[model samples]
Target chain A: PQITLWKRPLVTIKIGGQLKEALLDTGADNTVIEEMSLPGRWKPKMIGGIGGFIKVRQYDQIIIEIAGHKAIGTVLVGPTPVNIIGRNLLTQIGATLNF
Target chain B: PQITLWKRPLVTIKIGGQLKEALLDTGADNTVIEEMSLPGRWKPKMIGGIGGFIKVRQYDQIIIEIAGHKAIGTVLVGPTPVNIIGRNLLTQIGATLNF
Candidate 1:
């Protein structure tokens, strides 16, 4: 699937047994999601973005289904305005930036 | 041109007659550049993202050459980890997200 930049590249994703919308962020290095409970051990971490840095909980080997494609990687749980599917998981799903 | 997510999708952009590396951000709604002096009248603005909101100076109709493609739009100048080319400009270059 190819998504034009006419709008935000928001896609449906299934994570932690729930479905939610996430941004396919080519600019982000790591995927960051809103605060949610996942059945796994996580470590405290911090991530930076356009504005600043925020503390997050890093969970490894998390399975996320993005736009019907499944990917497994690290997921950061934090107080983000929206869920972001970054390069870490985008690569696993073979997502690319094209012109 | 197609860019894989195996690495950060950065590209050289000529803005304000200066060449700089910027991220092609599908997640960002507006373009944001590191504090730079551009010749124009700007208005103070604020934008919010994953972490928080930051003050910026909005300059409209700014010309930016991205990866050999030319685009004109509003560019926000502020403190940021990296320069980001968002949808506002990416759409002008016909950039898309593909898998």
Candidate 2:
């Protein structure tokens, strides 16, 4: 699918057996989701953004279905204003920026 | 250009008669650059991200050459960790997300 930038580049994603909307963020280095509970052991971590750094929980080997494409990688659960699908997961699904 | 997500999608941008690298961020609603002086009267504004909100100066009708493509729009000058070229400028350059 080719998504224009006229609107927010949001897409439906399935994670932890639930569906949610996430932004395809080319700026973020790692994938981050709004604070949520996911099964498995997670490590405490910190990630930075435009404003500053925030504490988060990192869950590895997580499976996420992005636009129906399966991708498995590390997912950070944090206090993000929105769910961000960053380059880590984006690369798994062969997502790219084009002009 | 088709940019893969394996690396940070940083591109050269000419703004305020200076050359700088900026990330193409689909997740951000507006363009934001690190604190810099631009000629014009700007309005104080606040923008939010994963961590929190930050105060910025909004300069309108700013001309930016993104990847050699010219675009004019509102640009926020703030203490961002990195310069971000959001959807506003991305749309102007016909940037899109593809898989």
Candidate 3:
């Protein structure tokens, strides 16, 4: 399926059984979601962006569903202004750049 | 044509007859380049990113070629960490998001 990249490539997804709006960020290396309470063990991770680096909790083996396609991967929770669905999950859904 | 959305999605582009690598950023509203002198008059502008906003020099009437497609539009130049090919230029190249 194809989606139009609007001013912001935002998409709806269900993470850990909860629905959330996330930006489809091809530039991001990993998924970063706004900090939320979840039942899981996590490891400390750091992410670098336009500003600098920020610490996050990497929760592995989480289920994420985007447009009805489901995949298991790691989800990072941190103080991100927006939720970003990066290449880690995009590839699972067979995402490609078309022109 | 279609290109795989790699971890970085780095793309080749020609700006002002100089070839450079840029990140295909669907999240950005405007294209921003690392500071480079150009022969034109620019207007003061600002672009916000994941961290915050930064001032830029908005140069108009510049020619840019992406994946062999030519486009002329506004380009913001400043002390950016990386060169970004944003929605402004992506749309001109008929870019689409596929998964």
Candidate 4:
């Protein structure tokens, strides 16, 4: 699938049998979710961004569907202001940055 | 130019007569610089990101060179944890998000 650059590049993703919009954040090291409960086991994790660090739940195994592509990887759920699709999942779907 | 998605999407940008590395953040509405001195008048502004809100100096007309493409726009400089190239500049360079 092809994605066009918009003023704000947002993409739809399916996780936990629900659809949600997430930012395609190539700058982020891990995919961070706004907030949700997972069935699998997770660990406490902290991520540092612009202002400071935030605590998140690191779920090792989760299925994410992005633009019809299915990717299974680690996903962090917490009080993230926004949901982000980081490189961990972007690479699996062959997403690219271009001009 | 084309950029393959990496763990952290970093790009070289020249600003304020110096070269700097910044992340290509599609989620960010405005570009945020770590800290730099500019030769112009600016107003105080604030931006919110993954962590929290931070005070910044908004330069109305600043020239930013990304991937050899020059883009003139508003740039915010302050105590940001990392430098980010936002949609404000990406639009000028005709950048796109694709998979």
Per-prediction backbone clash count:
0, 0, 0, 0
lDDT of 2 by residue, B8-83 (tens): 9999999999999999999889999998999998999999988788999999999999999999999999999999
On a 0 to 100 scale, what is the lDDT of residue B40 in model 2? 90
Q: Which residue pairs of candidate 2 clash?
A: none
* 10 residues in a row with least lDDT, candidate 3 chain A: A1-10
| lDDT digits (tens) for residues B26-88 of candidate 3 | 767788898887778999997665565678999997899877889899899987788988888
Per-residue C-alpha lDDT of model 2 across residues A10-60, encoded as one tens digit per residue: 899999899999998998899999878898999999999877899999999
Tens digits of per-residue lDDT for model 4 on A1-99?
555555466778999999999888777778999888777789999998877899999998799998678999999998889899888888888888888
Candidate 4 Cα outliers beyond 4 Å, as residue runs: none
lDDT of 1 at B75: 97
lDDT of 4 at B18: 92
lDDT of 1 by residue, A18-97 (tens): 99999999988999999899978999998887778899999999999999999999999999999999999999989888
Which regions of candidate 1 fall more than 4 Å away from where they truly are? none
Residue B49 C-alpha lDDT in model 3: 55
TM-score of each: 0.98, 0.97, 0.91, 0.95
Q: What's the C-alpha lDDT at position A3 in model 4? A: 55
Taking the tens digit of each residue's C-alpha lDDT, what string does model 4 give over B1-99? 678876567889999999999998777788899888987899998788778889999998899998689999999999998899988888888887777
Location of the lowest summed lDDT over 10 successive residues in candidate 1 chain B: B44-53
Q: For model 4, what is the error of residue B81's alpha carbon versus the real structure, in angstroms, after optimal superposition?
A: 1.2
Clashing residue pairs, backbone N/CA/C < 3 A, model 1: none
